[PDB]
């Protein structure tokens, strides 16, 4: 079932198993609210800016919660994506 | 559990069993980025403009996505509603 991390005018959709959607939602779900608000180009330094970049800042979200078997998941969904 | 489909100022909601409700919600989700804009009074063609339209639009979308057991439970539940 697709997954789809959005901020602003930019979205990287990625395939996430059936049986970790439930539990991939709840990261998600803590990673919205560390983000600001969309300002004008992205031009925040904080600010991701790029889908690569998006989904960058979300795979070193998921490092600071103690939840494995989704990091190095999300990881390996990095490199052949 | 209920389901709500959404767009603009009218809704439909219709209640999809238990053991349905995740993978119902994936093809929703592939649903709402298939709409255009909510513009004065839904008088764009190709935007509902109905409950029993936005969900006729929602039974011609799933038959599009190769995923069955959802399209003839949606198709006898418009039928009953």
Redesign the interface.
């Known amino acids: ?2 997954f ?1 991390l959005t901020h602003g005018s930019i979205e990287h959709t990625l395939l996430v198993p ?1 049986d970790l ?1 439930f539990n991939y939602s709840q990261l998600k779900d803590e990673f919205i609210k560390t983000l600001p608000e969309p300002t004008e180009g992205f031009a925040g330094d904080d600010e991701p800016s790029s889908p690569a970049e998006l989904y960058g800042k979300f795979i070193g979200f998921i490092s600071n919660a103690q939840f494995p078997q989704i990091v190095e998941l999300s990881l390996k969904d990095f490199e052949s994506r």
């Open positions: 079932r697709p789809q059936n959607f």
